mmCIF file of C-alpha atoms and ligand atoms in Angstrom:
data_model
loop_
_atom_site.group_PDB
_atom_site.id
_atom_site.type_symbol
_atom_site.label_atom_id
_atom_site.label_comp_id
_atom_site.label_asym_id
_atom_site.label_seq_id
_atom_site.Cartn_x
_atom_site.Cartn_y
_atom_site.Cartn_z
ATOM 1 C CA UNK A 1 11.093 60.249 -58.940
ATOM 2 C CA UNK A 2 8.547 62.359 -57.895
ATOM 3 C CA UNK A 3 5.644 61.603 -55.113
ATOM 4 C CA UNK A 4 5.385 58.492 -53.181
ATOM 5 C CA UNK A 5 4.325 55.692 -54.957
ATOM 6 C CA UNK A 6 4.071 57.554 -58.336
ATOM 7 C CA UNK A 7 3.850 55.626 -61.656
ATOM 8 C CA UNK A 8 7.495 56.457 -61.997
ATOM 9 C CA UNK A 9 8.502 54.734 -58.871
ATOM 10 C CA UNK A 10 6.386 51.362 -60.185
ATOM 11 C CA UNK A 11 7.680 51.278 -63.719
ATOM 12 C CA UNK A 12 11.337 52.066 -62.220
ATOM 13 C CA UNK A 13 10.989 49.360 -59.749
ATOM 14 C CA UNK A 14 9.818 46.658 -62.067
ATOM 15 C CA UNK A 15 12.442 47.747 -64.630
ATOM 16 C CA UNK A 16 15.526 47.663 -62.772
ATOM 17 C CA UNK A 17 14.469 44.426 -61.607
ATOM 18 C CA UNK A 18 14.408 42.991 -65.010
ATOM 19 C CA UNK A 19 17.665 44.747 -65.582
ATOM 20 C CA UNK A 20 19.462 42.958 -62.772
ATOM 21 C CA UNK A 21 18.409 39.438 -63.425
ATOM 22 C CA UNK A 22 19.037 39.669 -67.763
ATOM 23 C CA UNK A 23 22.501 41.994 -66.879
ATOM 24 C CA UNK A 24 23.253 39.765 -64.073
ATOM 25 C CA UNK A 25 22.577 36.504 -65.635
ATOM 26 C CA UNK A 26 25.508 36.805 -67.492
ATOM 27 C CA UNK A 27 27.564 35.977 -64.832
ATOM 28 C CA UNK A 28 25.908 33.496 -62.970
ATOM 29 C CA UNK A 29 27.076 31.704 -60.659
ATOM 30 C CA UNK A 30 31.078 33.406 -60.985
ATOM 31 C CA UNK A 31 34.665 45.713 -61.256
ATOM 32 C CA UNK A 32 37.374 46.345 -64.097
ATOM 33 C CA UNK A 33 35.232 43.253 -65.453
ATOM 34 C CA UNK A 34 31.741 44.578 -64.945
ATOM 35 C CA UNK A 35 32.409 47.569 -66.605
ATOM 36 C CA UNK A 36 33.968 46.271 -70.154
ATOM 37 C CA UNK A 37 30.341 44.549 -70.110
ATOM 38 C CA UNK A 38 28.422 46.762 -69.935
ATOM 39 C CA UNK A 39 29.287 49.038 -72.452
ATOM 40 C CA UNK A 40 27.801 46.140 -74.832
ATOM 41 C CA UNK A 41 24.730 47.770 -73.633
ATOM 42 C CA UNK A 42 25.424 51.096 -75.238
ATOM 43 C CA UNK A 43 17.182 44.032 -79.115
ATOM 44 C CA UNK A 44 15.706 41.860 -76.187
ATOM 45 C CA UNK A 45 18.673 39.492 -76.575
ATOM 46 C CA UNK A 46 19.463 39.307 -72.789
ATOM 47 C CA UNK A 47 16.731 36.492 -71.768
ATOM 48 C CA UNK A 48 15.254 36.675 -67.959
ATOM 49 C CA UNK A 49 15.746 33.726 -66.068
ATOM 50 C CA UNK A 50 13.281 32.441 -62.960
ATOM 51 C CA UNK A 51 13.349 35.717 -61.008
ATOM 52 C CA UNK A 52 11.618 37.693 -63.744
ATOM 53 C CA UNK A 53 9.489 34.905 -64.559
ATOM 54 C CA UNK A 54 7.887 34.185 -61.027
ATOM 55 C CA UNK A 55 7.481 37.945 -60.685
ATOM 56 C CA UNK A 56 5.422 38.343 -63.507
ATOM 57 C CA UNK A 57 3.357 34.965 -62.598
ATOM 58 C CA UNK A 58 3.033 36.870 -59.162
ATOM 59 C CA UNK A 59 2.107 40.312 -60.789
ATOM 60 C CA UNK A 60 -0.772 38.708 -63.084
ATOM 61 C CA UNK A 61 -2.333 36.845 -59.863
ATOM 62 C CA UNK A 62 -2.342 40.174 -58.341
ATOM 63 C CA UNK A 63 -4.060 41.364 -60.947
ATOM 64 C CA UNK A 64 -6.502 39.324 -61.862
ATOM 65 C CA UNK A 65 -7.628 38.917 -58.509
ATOM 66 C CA UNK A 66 -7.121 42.579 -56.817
ATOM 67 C CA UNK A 67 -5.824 40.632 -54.440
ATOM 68 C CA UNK A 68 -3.409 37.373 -52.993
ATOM 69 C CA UNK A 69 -5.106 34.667 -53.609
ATOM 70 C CA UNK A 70 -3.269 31.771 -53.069
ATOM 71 C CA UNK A 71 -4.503 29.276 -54.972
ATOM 72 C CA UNK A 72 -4.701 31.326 -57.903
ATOM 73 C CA UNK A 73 -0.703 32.337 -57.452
ATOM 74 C CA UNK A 74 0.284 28.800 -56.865
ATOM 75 C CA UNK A 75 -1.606 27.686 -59.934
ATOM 76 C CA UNK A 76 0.432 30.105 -61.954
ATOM 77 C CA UNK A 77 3.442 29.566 -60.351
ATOM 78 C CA UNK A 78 3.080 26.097 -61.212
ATOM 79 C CA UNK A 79 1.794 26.579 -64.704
ATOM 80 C CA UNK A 80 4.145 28.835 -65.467
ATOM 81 C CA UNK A 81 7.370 26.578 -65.148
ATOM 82 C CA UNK A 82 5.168 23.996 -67.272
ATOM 83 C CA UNK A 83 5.136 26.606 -70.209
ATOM 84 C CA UNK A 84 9.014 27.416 -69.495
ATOM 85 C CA UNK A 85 10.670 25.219 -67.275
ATOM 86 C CA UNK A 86 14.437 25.699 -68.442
ATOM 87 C CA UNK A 87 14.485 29.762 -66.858
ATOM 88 C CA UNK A 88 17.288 28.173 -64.506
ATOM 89 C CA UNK A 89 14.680 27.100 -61.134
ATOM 90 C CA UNK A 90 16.327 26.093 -57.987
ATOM 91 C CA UNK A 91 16.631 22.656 -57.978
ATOM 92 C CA UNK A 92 14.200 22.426 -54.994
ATOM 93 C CA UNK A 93 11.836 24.201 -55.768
ATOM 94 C CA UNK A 94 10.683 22.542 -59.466
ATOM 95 C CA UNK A 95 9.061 19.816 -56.763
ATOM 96 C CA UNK A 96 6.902 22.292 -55.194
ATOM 97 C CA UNK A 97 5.571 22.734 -58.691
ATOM 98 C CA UNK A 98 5.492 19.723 -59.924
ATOM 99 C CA UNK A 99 2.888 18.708 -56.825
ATOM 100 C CA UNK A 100 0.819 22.239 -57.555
ATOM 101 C CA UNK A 101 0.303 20.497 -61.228
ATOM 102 C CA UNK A 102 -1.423 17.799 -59.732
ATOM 103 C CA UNK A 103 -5.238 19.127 -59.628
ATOM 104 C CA UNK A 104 -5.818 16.646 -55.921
ATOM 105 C CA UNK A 105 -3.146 18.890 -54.597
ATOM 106 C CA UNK A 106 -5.746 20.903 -52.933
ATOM 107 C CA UNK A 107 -3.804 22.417 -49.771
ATOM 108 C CA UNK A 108 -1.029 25.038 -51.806
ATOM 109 C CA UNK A 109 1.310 25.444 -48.399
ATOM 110 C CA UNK A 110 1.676 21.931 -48.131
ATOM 111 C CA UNK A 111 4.405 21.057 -51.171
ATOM 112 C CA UNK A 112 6.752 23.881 -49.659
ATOM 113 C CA UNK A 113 6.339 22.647 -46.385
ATOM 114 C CA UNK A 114 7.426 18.863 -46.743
ATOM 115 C CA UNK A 115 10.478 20.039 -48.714
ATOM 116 C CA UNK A 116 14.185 20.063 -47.273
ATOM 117 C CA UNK A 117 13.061 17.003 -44.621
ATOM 118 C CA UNK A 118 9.573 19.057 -43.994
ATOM 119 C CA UNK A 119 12.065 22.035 -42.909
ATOM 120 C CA UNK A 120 10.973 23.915 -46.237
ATOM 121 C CA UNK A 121 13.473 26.193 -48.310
ATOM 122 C CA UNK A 122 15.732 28.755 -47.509
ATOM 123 C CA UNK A 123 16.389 29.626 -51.246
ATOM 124 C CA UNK A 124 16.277 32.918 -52.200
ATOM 125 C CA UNK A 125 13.408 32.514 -54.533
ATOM 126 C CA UNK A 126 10.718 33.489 -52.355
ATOM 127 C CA UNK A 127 12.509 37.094 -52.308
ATOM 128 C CA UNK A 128 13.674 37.250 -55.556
ATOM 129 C CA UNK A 129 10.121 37.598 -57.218
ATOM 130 C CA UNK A 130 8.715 39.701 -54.473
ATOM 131 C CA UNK A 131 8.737 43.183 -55.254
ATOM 132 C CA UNK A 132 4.930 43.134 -56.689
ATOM 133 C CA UNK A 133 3.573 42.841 -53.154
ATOM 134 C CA UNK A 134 5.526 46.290 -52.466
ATOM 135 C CA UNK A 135 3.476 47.768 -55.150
ATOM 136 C CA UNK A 136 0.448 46.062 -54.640
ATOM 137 C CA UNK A 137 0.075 46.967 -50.957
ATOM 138 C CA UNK A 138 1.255 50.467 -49.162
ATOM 139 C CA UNK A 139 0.909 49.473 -45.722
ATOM 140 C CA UNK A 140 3.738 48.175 -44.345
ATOM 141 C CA UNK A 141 1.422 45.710 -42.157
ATOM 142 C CA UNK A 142 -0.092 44.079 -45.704
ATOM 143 C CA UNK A 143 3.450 44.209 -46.944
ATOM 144 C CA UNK A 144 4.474 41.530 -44.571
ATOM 145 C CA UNK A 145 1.819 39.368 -44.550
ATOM 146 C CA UNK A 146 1.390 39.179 -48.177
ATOM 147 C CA UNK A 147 5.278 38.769 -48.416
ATOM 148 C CA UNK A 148 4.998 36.017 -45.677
ATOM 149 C CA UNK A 149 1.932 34.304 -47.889
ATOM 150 C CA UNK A 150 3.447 34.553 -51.640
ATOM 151 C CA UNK A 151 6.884 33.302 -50.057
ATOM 152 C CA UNK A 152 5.395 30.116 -48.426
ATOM 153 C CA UNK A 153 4.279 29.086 -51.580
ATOM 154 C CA UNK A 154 7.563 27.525 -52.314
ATOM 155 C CA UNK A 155 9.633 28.851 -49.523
ATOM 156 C CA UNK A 156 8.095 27.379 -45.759
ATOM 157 C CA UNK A 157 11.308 27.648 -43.699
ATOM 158 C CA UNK A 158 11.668 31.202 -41.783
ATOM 159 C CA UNK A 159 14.808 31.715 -42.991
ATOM 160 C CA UNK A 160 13.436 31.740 -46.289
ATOM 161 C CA UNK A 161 10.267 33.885 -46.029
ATOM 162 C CA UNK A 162 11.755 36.370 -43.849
ATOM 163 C CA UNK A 163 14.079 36.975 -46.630
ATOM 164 C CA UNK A 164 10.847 38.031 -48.804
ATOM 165 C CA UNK A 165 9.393 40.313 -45.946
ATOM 166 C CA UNK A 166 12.691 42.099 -45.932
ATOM 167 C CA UNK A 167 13.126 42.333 -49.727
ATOM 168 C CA UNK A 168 9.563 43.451 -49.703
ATOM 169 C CA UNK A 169 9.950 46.488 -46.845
ATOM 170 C CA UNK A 170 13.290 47.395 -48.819
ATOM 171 C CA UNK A 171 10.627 48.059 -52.024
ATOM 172 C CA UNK A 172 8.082 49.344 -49.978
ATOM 173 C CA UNK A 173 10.321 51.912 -48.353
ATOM 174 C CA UNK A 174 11.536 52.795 -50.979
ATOM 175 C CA UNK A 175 9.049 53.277 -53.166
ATOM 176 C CA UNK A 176 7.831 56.413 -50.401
ATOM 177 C CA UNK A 177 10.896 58.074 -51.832
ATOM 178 C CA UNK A 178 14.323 60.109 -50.353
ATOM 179 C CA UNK A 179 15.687 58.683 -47.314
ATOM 180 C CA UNK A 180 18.958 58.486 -45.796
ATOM 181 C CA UNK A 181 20.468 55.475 -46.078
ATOM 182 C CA UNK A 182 20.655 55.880 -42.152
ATOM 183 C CA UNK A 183 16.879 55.642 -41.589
ATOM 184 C CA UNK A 184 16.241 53.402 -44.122
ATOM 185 C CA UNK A 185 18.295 50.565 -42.683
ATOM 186 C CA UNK A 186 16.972 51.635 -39.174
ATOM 187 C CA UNK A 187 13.540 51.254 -40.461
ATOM 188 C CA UNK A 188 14.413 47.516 -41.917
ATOM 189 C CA UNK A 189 16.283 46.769 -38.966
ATOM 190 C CA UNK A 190 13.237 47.415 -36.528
ATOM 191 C CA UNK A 191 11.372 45.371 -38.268
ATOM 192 C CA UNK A 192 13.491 42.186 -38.466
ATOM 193 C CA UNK A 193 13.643 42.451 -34.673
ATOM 194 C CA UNK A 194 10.317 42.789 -34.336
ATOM 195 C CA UNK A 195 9.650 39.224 -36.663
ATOM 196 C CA UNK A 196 12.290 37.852 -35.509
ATOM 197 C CA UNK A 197 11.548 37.384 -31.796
ATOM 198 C CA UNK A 198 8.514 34.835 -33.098
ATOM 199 C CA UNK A 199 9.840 31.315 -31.383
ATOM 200 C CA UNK A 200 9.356 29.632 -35.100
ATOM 201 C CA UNK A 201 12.228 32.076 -36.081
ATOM 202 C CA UNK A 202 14.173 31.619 -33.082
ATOM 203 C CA UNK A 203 13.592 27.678 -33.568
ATOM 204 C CA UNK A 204 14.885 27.308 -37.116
ATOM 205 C CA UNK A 205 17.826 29.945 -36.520
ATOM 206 C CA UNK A 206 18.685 27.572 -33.494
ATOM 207 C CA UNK A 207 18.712 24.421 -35.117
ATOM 208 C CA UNK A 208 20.804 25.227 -37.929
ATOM 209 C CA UNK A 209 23.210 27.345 -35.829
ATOM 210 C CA UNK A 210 22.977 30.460 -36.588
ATOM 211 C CA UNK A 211 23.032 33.843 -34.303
ATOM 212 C CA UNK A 212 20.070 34.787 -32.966
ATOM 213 C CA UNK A 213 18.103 36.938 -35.225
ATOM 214 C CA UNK A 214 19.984 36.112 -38.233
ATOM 215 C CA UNK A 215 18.429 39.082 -40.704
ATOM 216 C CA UNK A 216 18.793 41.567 -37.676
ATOM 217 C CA UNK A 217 22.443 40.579 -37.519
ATOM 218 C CA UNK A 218 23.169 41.217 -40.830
ATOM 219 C CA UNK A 219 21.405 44.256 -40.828
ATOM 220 C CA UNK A 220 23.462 45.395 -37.781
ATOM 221 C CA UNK A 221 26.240 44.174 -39.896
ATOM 222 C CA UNK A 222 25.273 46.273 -42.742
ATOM 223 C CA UNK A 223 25.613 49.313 -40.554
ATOM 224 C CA UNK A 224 29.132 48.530 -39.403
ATOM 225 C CA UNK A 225 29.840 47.727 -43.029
ATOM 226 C CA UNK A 226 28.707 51.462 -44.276
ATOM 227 C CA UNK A 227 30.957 53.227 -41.715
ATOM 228 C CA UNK A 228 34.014 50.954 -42.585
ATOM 229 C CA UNK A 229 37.015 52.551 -44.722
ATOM 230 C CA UNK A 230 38.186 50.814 -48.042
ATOM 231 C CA UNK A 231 35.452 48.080 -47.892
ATOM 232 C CA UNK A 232 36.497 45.513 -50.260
ATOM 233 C CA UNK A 233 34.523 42.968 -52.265
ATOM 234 C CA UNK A 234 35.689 39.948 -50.461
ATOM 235 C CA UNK A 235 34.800 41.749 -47.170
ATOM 236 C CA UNK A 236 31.648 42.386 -48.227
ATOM 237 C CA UNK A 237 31.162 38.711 -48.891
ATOM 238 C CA UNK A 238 32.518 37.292 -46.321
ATOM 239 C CA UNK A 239 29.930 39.760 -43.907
ATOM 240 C CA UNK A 240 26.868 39.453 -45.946
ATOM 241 C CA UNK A 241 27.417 36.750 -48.772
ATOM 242 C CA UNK A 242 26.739 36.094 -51.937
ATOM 243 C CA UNK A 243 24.978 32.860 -52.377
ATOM 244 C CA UNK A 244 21.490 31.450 -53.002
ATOM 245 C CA UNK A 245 20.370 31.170 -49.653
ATOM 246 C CA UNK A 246 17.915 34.222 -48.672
ATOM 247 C CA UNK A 247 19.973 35.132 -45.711
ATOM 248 C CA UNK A 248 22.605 35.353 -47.686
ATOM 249 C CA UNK A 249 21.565 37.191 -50.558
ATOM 250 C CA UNK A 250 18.803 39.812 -49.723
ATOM 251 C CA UNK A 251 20.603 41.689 -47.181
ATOM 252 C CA UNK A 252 23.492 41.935 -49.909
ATOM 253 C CA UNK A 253 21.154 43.191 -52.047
ATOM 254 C CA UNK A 254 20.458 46.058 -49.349
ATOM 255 C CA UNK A 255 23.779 46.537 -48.629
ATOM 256 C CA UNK A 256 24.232 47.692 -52.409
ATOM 257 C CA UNK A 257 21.672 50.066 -52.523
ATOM 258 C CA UNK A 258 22.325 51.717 -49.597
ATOM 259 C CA UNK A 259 26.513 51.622 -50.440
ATOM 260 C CA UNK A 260 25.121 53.185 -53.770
ATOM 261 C CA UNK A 261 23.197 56.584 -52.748
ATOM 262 C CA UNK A 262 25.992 58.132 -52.857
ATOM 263 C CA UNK A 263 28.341 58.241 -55.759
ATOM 264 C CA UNK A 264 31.829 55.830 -55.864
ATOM 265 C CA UNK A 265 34.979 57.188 -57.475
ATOM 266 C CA UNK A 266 35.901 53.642 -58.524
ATOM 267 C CA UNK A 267 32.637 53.510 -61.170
ATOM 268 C CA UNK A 268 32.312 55.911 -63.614
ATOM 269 C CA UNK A 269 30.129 59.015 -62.784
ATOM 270 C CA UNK A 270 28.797 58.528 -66.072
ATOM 271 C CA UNK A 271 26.696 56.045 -64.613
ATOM 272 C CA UNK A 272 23.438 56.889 -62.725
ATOM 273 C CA UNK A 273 22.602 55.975 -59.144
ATOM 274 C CA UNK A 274 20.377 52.855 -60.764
ATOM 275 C CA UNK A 275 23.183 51.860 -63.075
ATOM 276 C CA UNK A 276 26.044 52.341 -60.743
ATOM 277 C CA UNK A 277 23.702 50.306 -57.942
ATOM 278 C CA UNK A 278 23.419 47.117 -60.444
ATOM 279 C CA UNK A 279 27.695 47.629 -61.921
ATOM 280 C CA UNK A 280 28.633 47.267 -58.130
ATOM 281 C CA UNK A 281 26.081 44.398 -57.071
ATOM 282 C CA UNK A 282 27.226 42.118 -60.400
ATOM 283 C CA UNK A 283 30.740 43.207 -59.338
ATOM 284 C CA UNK A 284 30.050 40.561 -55.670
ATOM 285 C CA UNK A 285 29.744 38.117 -58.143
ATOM 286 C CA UNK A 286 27.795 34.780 -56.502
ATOM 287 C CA UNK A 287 23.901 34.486 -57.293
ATOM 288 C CA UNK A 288 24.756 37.743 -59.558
ATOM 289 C CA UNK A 289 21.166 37.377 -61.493
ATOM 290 C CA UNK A 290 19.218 37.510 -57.740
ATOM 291 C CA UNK A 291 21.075 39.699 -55.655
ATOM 292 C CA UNK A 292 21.157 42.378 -58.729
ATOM 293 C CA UNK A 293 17.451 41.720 -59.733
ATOM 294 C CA UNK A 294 16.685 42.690 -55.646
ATOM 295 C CA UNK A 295 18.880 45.612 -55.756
ATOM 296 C CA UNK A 296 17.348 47.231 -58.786
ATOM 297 C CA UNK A 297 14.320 46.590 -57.749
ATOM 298 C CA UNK A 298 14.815 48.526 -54.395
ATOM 299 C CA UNK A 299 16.457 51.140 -56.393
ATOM 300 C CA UNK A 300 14.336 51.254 -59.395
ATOM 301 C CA UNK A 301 11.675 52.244 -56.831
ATOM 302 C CA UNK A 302 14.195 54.945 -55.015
ATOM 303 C CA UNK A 303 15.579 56.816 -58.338
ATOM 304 C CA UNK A 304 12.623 56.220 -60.686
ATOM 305 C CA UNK A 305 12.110 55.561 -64.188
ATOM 306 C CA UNK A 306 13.979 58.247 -65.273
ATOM 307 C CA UNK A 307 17.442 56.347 -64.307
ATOM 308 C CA UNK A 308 16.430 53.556 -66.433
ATOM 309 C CA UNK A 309 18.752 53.634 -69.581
ATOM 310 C CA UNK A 310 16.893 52.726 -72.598
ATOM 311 C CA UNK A 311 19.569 51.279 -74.083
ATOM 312 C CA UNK A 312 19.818 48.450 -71.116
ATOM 313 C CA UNK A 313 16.336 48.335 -70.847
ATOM 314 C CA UNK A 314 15.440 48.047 -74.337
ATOM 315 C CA UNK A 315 18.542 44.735 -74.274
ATOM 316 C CA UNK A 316 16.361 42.844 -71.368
ATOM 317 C CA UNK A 317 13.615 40.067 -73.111
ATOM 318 C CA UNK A 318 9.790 41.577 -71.786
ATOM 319 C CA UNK A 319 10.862 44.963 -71.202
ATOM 320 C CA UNK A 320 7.417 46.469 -72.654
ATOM 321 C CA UNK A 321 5.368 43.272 -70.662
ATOM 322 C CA UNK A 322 7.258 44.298 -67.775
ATOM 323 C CA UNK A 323 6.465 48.035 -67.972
ATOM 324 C CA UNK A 324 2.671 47.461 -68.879
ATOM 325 C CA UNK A 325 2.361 44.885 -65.892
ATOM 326 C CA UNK A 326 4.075 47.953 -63.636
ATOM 327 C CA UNK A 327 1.568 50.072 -65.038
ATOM 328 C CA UNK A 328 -1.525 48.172 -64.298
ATOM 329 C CA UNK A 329 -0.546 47.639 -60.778
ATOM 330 C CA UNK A 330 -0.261 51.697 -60.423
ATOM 331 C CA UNK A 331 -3.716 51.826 -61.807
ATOM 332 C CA UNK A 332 -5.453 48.690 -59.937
ATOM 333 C CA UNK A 333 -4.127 49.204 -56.338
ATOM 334 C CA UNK A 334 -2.771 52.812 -56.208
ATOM 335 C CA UNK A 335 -5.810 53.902 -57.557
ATOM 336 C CA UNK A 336 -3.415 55.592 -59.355
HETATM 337 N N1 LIG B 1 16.486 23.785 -45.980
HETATM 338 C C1 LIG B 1 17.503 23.553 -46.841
HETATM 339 N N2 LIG B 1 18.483 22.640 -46.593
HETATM 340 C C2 LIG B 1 19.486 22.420 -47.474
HETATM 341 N N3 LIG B 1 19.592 23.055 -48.661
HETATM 342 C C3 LIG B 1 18.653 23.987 -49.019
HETATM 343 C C4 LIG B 1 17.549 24.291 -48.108
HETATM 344 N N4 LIG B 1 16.798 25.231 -48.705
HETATM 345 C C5 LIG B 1 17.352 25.525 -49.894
HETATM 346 N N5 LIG B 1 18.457 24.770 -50.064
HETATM 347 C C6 LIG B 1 19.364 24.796 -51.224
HETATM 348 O O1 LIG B 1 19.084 25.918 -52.068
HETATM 349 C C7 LIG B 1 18.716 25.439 -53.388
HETATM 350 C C8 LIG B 1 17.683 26.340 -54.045
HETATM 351 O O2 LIG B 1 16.526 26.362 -53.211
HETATM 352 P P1 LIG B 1 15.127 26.101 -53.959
HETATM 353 O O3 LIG B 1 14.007 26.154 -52.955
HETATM 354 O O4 LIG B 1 15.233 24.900 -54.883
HETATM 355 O O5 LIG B 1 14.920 27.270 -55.038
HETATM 356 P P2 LIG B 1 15.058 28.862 -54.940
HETATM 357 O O6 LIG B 1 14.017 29.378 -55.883
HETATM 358 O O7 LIG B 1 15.190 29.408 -53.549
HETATM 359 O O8 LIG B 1 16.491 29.034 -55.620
HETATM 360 C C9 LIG B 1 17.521 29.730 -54.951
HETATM 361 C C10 LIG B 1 18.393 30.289 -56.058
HETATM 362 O O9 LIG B 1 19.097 29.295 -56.792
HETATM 363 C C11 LIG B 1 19.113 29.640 -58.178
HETATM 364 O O10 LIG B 1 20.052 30.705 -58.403
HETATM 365 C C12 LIG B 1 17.750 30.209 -58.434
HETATM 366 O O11 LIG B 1 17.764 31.152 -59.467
HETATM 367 C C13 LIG B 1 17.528 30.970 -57.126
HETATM 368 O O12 LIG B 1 18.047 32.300 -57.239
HETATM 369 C C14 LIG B 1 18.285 23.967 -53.198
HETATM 370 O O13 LIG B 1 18.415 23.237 -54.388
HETATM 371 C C15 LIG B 1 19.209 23.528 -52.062
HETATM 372 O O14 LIG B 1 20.469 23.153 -52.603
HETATM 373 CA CA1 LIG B 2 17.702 33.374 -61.949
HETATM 374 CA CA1 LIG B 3 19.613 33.098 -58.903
#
């Protein structure tokens, strides 16, 4: 709530991040369902898995640099899944980090390039720890090149960096507060296009098979989706996915925000518009702990801090970390 980019919006975003991957992460991997759980939210004994854990190593680079420095971020990245390497990693990826360990590693892109065949990943990892850069940068031109840079870390393959820059504009946009849902998927959808006419995206979407402009389909998708009577779970899926893959996750994790601004007879209006968001993106099922950690992040920004429920927040392991590190990027790069 409130003005664009407020404290509010930071501390919302970073906390309904943290709520999707500990409230999601219970069914990993897997509506009448959903809800029963939940109400065994009504301390810190939901643990955070690799999405929270590579956001925060991405926060504090941020941090202590004022800026993306890669090096730096790769070095924590790395030294981060030494400390706690059992937060449920792609499989991948843990290679990528294992050759950041090694102090002759001295070019950070390289690892993520030479993995997948020297294709890199399309994992939604890159994406899933994003939403820092949203906060650390209001211009959407920084957005996407800071986006692009933290995501090639681990993630080299368009398909899975593009996923970031989208998950990032969803924060970013969202963190400048109201919107229809309308104009906020225009917005996104102008600027897949846009990214998606560079010949190393048309190359890889190509060579695997896919439509051209895969995140700008889907996003069309999205909008054929929201106009659609009695849109069911399945066809939701089936459209947009479910999975681990980027392309096939982030835009899901859109679709449920923007599904969610307005209220939904089938989930309780006792419920907020953040809690109501994260009940319906669980209820996919699929990479539940991803796709809900990117849709509460997009709408902790939106609806604010005030939507956070103490009682869920105060169940997720970091909470306070998590709210001090949203704090500290208010005060370091919005200048508060
Ligand atoms: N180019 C590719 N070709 C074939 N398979 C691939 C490719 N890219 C990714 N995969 C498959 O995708 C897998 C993960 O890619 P990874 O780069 O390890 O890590 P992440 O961080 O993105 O993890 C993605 C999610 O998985 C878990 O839920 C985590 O929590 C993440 O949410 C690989 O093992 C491959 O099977
Ligand atoms: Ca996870
Ligand atoms: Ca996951």
């Amino acid at each position: 709530a409130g003005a664009a980019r407020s404290l509010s919006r930071f501390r919302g975003c970073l906390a309904g991040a943290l709520l999707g991957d500990c409230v999601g992460s219970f069914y990993e991997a897997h509506l009448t369902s959903v809800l029963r759980h939940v109400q065994s939210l009504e301390t810190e004994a939901l643990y955070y898995t690799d999405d929270t854990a590579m956001a925060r190593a991405l926060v504090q680079s941020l941090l202590a640099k004022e800026a993306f420095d890669e090096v730096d971020m790769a070095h924590r990245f790395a030294q981060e899944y030494k400390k706690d390497p059992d937060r449920g990693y792609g499989a991948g990826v843990v290679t990528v980090f294992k050759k950041l360990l090694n102090p002759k590693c001295r070019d950070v892109f390289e690892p993520a390039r030479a993995q997948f065949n020297g294709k890199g990943s399309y994992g939604n990892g890159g994406a899933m720890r994003v939403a820092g850069i949203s906060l650390a940068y209001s211009s959407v031109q920084d957005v996407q090149k800071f986006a692009r840079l933290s995501a090639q870390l681990t993630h080299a393959s368009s398909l899975g960096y593009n996923g970031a820059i989208l998950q990032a504009l969803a924060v970013h946009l969202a963190l400048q507060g109201e919107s229809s849902s309308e104009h906020f998927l225009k917005q996104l959808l102008g600027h897949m296009e846009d990214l998606e006419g560079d010949a190393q995206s048309v190359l890889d979407a190509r060579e695997l098979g896919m439509e051209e402009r895969p995140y700008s389909s889907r996003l069309k998708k999205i909008g054929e989706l929201l106009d659609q009577a009695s849109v069911t779970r399945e066809e939701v899926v089936s459209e947009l996915g479910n999975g681990i893959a980027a392309f096939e996750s982030v835009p899901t994790a859109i679709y449920c925000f923007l599904r969610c601004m307005e209220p939904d007879p089938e989930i309780p209006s006792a419920f907020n518009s953040l809690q109501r968001t994260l009940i319906y993106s669980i209820s996919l099922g699929g990479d539940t702990d991803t796709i809900a950690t990117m849709a509460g992040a997009i709408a902790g920004a939106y609806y604010g801090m005030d939507q956070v429920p103490e009682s869920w927040q105060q169940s997720c392991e970091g909470y306070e970390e998590t709210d001090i590190l949203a704090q500290s990027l208010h005060r370091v790069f919005q200048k508060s």
